Amino acid sequence: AVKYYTLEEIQKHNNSKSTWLILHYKVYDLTKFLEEHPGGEAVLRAQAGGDATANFEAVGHSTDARELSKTFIIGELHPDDR
């Protein structure tokens, strides 16, 4: 299978580096994208844990981003979260 991650497991990644989150039932590791991500390592690290779909969408982001995200996809939201 793909190995989905629970909101909890994703929630464990919210300290300094470990920065995961859920964007439309999809998990994106951006731990090695903090300093890289133009928004500035802050909003990403803060919204880390999950429930950033609205935040991500609120920014809008472009096609390039939408595609990049897929390259950063680590899996999907656990089938026991939804």
Per DSSP, the three-state class of 73 is strand
Identified binder of ligand HEM from the candidate list 12, 25, 39, 79, rule CB under 6 A: 39
Using the rule CB under 6 A, is 47 a contact of ligand HEM?
yes
- 13 annotated to bind ligand: no
Place of tokens 């989905």: 4
Using the rule CB under 6 A, is 54 a contact of ligand HEM?
no
CA distances from 17 to 33, 51, 60 (A): 9, 18, 24
Using the rule CB under 6 A, is 27 a contact of ligand HEM?
no
Give the residue ranges of the annotated binding site: 37, 61
* Residues that constitute the known binding site for heme: 37, 61
